C-alpha cells in the first residue's frame, strides 16, 4: 500500500520545487493503487506566512495532482499540520527517553556556543547525568533539549533506492536535538512520527535530506518501527547550473499560472526533470507518465530548469495538442484582463487560429493580437515611419476600398494587386503602409486574412484615422 506525501511549509510562495517533489510522489502512488497524503509543516512560526498554505494546496490542484489526505479536508490519520500535532511529539520524545535512546541536556546556547568553538560541536556531555537526576531538573522546569542517544560505539547502514546503500560510523552521526526547550520537534523528530503515524511507505524528498537519513533510520529503530523506503531526488538548478533561485529563475507556480503557462505543459516539463520516456517522447503528461514511471529512468544529475524550453513546450501545447476551441477558451481570461472583448465567438476563434503560430503563452495573446480587438492599439515607430512613406498611396487607395463590397481575401488581394499594377509600384509599397495603417505593427500574419477578418468598416474607419 504505497503511501507517499509532500510536506511543504507555509513559509511563502508555492515553489516549483514542491510541484516537482510532489509529482514523483503523486506518480509513485497512483502507479501503485496507493495513496498520496499532504502534511503541512507549519512549526517555524518565524517563517510562517498566512495565506501561503492556501496557495500551496491550490497550486498542486492546479497542476492536477490531487491528494487523498491533506489539511483542508483532514482524514483518517488525524492531524495534517505539525503545529497541531505538538503534543504527539513530547510524548514520543518522552517514550524515547523512557528507553534510553534520548536524553536531556541543559547547556545554555551560550554554553553550547563554547563547546562548539572547542570540540567542533556537541560532545554529548550531558549523557553522563544520572537519568533520575536529569528528571529532577526537568521537574523543577529547567530548560533543556531532548537529544538523540546514538549508540556511539556502533555502525549504521542506510539505503537509498536510487543511490544505493551507504555505511556510517555512528561517530559521524550526532546527538541531534529532537525537542527544543519550547518543545518543538526538529525535522528529525517530526518526520519519523508523522511518517509512521500517517503510514507513508516511501519517502520521496529533497536530496538535501540524504545525509540525515542515518538519523531518521536510528529513530525508526529507536521506536522499533519499520523504516520506509527513501528516494532522494536529484534537485533543481538553472541553465549554467546552481540550486535554482528566485533571483535567477522564477520559482513561483503562481507566476507561471499568471503568465499564461498551461498547467499541463508545466507538468509535462517537471516530468522531464530527470526521467526519460523509453520512446524518447517529451509530450504527454500524467496518465501516460504515471505508467511509464519507473525508478529505472530517473536521472541523478540535478536537472536544468530552462524556461526557454518550457515556453517551447507551452507553445507546442498551444499548437499541436489543444484544439482551437480549447485554446480559444483559455485565452478568454487574459483578454478580459487586458480589457478586451470579441464581437462573436467566431471572430475569437478566427483570431486565435491566425495568431497561433505567434504566441507561446496564453498571456502573449492579448499583447500580439491587440489590434484585432480594439480600435486603440499601439503603432510602432517603424510602422508610423512606413505609414508616411506610403501615405500618398493609401490616399489614392481609400476610394477603391470604400467601393469594395465583397470583403474576402480573394477580392481584396485582386484589388490590391490591381492598384500596385495600376500605379507602377510593386505590391509591397502598398502592402507595408496598409499593414502599418491596419495593425500598427509592420510584422503580422497574412495581410489579406488581417484585412478581411476585421471587416470593412473597421478597416475603413482605421484607414481614415491614419490619412484624415
UniProtKB/Swiss-Prot annotation:
The record marks 358 as: Essential for discrimination between tRNA(Glu) and tRNA(Gln). The keyword Protein biosynthesis applies. The gene is gltX. This is Glutamate--tRNA ligase. The lineage of its organism: Bacteria, Thermotogati, Deinococcota, Deinococci, Thermales. Changing residue 358 to Q: Reduces affinity for tRNA and abolishes the ability to discriminate between tRNA(Glu) and tRNA(Gln). GO terms for biological process: glutamyl-tRNA aminoacylation. Catalyzes the attachment of glutamate to tRNA(Glu) in a two-step reaction: glutamate is first activated by ATP to form Glu-AMP and then transferred to the acceptor end of tRNA(Glu). Belongs to the class-I aminoacyl-tRNA synthetase family. Glutamate--tRNA ligase type 1 subfamily. Monomer. It comes from Thermus thermophilus (strain ATCC 27634 / DSM 579 / HB8). The record marks 354 as: Interaction with tRNA.
Amino acid at each position: 500500500m504505497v503511501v507517499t506525501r509532500i510536506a511543504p511549509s507555509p513559509t511563502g510562495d508555492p515553489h516549483v520545487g514542491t510541484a516537482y517533489i510532489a509529482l514523483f510522489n503523486y506518480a509513485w502512488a497512483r502507479r501503485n493503487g496507493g495513496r498520496f497524503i499532504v502534511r503541512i509543516e507549519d512549526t517555524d512560526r518565524a517563517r510562517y506566512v498566512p495565506g501561503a498554505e492556501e496557495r500551496i494546496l491550490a497550486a498542486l490542484k492546479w497542476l492536477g495532482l490531487s491528494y487523498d489526505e491533506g489539511p483542508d479536508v483532514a482524514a483518517p490519520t488525524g492531524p495534517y499540520r505539525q503545529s497541531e500535532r505538538l503534543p504527539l511529539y513530547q510524548k514520543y520524545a518522552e517514550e524515547l527517553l523512557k528507553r534510553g535512546w534520548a536524553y536531556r541536556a541543559f547547556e545554555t546556547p551560550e554554553e553550547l556556543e563554547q563547546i562548539r568553538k572547542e570540540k567542533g560541536g556537541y560532545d554529548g556531555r550531558a549523557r553522563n547525568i544520572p537519568p533520575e537526576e536529569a528528571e529532577e531538573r526537568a521537574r523543577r522546569g529547567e530548560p533543556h533539549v531532548i537529544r538523540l542517544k546514538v549508540p556511539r560505539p556502533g555502525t549504521t547502514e542506510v539505503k537509498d533506492e536510487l543511490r544505493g546503500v551507504v555505511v556510517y560510523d555512528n561517530q559521524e552521526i550526532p546527538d541531534v536535538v529532537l525537542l527544543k526547550s519550547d518543545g518543538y520537534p526538529t525535522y528529525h523528530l517530526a518526520n519519523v512520527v508523522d511518517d509512521h503515524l500517517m503510514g507513508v511507505t516511501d519517502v520521496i524528498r529533497a536530496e538535501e535530506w540524504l545525509v540525515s537519513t542515518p538519523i531518521h533510520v536510528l529513530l525508526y529503530r529507536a521506536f522499533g518501527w519499520e523504516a520506509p523506503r527513501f528516494y532522494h531526488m536529484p534537485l533543481l538548478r538553472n541553465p549554467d547550473k546552481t540550486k535554482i533561485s528566485k533571483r535567477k529563475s522564477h520559482t513561483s507556480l503562481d507566476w507561471y499560472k499568471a503568465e499564461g503557462f498551461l498547467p499541463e505543459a508545466l507538468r509535462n516539463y517537471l516530468c522531464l526533470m530527470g526521467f526519460s520516456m523509453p520512446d524518447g517522447r517529451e509530450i504527454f503528461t500524467l496518465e501516460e507518465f504515471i505508467q511509464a514511471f519507473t525508478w529505472e529512468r530517473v536521472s541523478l544529475g540535478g536537472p536544468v530548469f530552462d524556461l526557454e524550453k518550457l515556453r517551447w513546450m507551452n507553445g507546442k501545447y498551444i499548437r499541436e495538442v489543444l484544439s482551437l476551441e480549447e485554446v480559444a477558451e483559455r485565452v478568454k481570461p487574459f483578454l478580459r484582463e487586458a480589457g478586451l472583448s470579441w464581437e462573436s465567438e467566431a471572430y475569437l476563434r478566427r483570431a486565435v487560429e491566425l495568431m497561433r503560430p505567434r504566441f507561446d503563452t496564453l498571456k502573449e495573446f492579448p499583447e500580439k493580437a491587440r489590434y484585432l480587438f480594439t480600435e486603440d492599439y499601439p503603432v510602432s515607430e517603424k510602422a508610423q515611419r512606413k505609414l508616411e512613406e506610403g501615405l500618398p498611396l493609401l490616399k489614392e487607395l481609400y476610394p477603391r476600398l470604400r467601393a469594395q463590397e465583397e470583403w474576402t481575401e480573394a477580392a481584396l488581394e485582386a484589388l490590391l494587386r490591381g492598384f500596385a499594377a495600376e500605379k507602377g509600384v510593386k505590391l509591397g509599397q502598398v502592402a507595408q503602409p496598409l499593414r502599418a495603417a491596419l495593425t500598427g505593427s509592420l510584422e503580422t500574419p497574412g495581410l489579406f486574412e488581417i484585412l478581411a477578418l476585421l471587416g470593412k468598416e473597421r478597416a475603413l474607419r482605421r484607414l481614415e484615422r491614419a490619412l484624415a
